[PDB]
């Protein structure tokens, strides 16, 4: 709000904090990104390297939903089982009754391997996995069942 601003403190002082010499003007260096290659070059090269120039391929008519693939990691994989019923599977870590985790409905397209799941076998239904994510699921006695 207004009463806490330095404008109220600068009342009575001539230059309002802008100086007597610099003498606050309209646009002393230009407007916006003016002079990014001429007289603001040092600031742009120091703080925004890469700004000027061209990089690789263009992509006409990009639809981001083509590339939709949220990643889930193995240390977060057991969060897709509900909180209460999770403990039942942790005991009796055996086959023939293994939790089916369908990560697509949980909103994930790829399962990644950040790792260290418990040794409970688990059935993972994923659109995509990595080699290491699959390896640790099979090292626990589970299976990655590919879905679409």
């Amino acid at each position: 709000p207004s009463r806490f601003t330095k404008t109220r403190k600068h009342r009575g002082h001539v230059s309002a904090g802008k100086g007597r010499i610099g003498k606050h003007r309209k646009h002393p260096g230009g407007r916006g990104m003016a002079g990014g290659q001429h007289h603001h070059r040092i600031n742009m090269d120091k703080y925004h390297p890469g700004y000027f120039g061209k990089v690789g391929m263009r992509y006409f008519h990009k639809q981001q939903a083509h590339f939709w693939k949220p990643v889930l990691n193995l240390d977060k994989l057991w969060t897709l089982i509900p909180e209460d019923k999770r403990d039942q599977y942790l005991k009796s870590a055996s086959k023939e009754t293994a939790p089916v985790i369908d990560t697509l409905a949980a909103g994930y397209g790829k399962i990644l391997g950040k790792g260290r799941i418990p040794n409970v076998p688990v059935i993972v239904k994923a659109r995509f996995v990595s080699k290491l994510a699959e390896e640790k699921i099979r090292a626990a006695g589970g299976v990655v069942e590919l879905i679409a």
């Binding site: 703080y47 925004h48 700004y51 000027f52 977060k76 057991w78 969060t79």
Partner: protein, 185 residues
């Protein structure tokens, strides 16, 4: 006239109080100010200073961070003390039975610690049962893992994160960032 070697009237540059107006945090400061003055225990002076800390200066402490500090030999039976917020961590599947003292517990953190057989107490229950902070374990969360710290000290060849709104190709991956376009940093 005095040939002054140092700046005169210089403030210490440390908080002597929390900037917070929390009436309950002020009672905790009031109790530990008394404790740090009438006892010679270094723990009471450390906790008192930590109760002045700003929000970024007390990062959250995970229960997994708590549990890793209990893998130190002889530290299992110590009372973990966190001057800040204890959060939950789903990545860790076993939690020991321990007593944790914190300013705040998240609901997931309090559930996980209690379900393990442990106990969650406030810093004034800690003061009653450990007036000199005997058998305690102060844990602090990582300070520089904040995203803001990524951009601190930006410059050529320093490998820091640029302050940028939109990322991807076309956003600062050109002249200045690869030898094919001018120079690399």
């Amino acid at each position: 006239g005095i040939d002054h070697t140092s700046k005169q009237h210089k403030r210490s540059g440390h908080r002597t109080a929390p900037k917070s107006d929390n009436v309950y945090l002020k009672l905790l400061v009031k109790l530990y100010t008394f404790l740090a003055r009438r006892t010679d225990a270094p723990f009471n002076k450390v906790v008192l200073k930590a109760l002045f800390l700003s929000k970024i200066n007390r990062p959250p402490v995970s229960v997994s961070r708590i549990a890793r500090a209990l893998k130190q030999e002889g530290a299992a039976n110590k009372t973990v003390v966190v001057v800040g917020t204890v959060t939950d961590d789903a990545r860790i599947f076993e939690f020991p039975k321990t007593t944790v003292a914190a300013l705040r517990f998240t609901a997931g953190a309090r559930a996980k610690i209690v379900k393990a057989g442990g106990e969650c107490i406030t810093l004034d229950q800690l003061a009653v049962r450990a007036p000199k902070g005997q058998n305690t374990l102060i844990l602090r969360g990582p300070r520089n893992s904040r995203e803001a710290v990524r951009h601190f000290g930006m410059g050529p060849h320093k490998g820091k994160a640029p302050r940028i709104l939109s990322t991807g190709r076309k956003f600062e991956r050109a002249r200045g960032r690869r030898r094919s376009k001018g120079f690399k940093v």
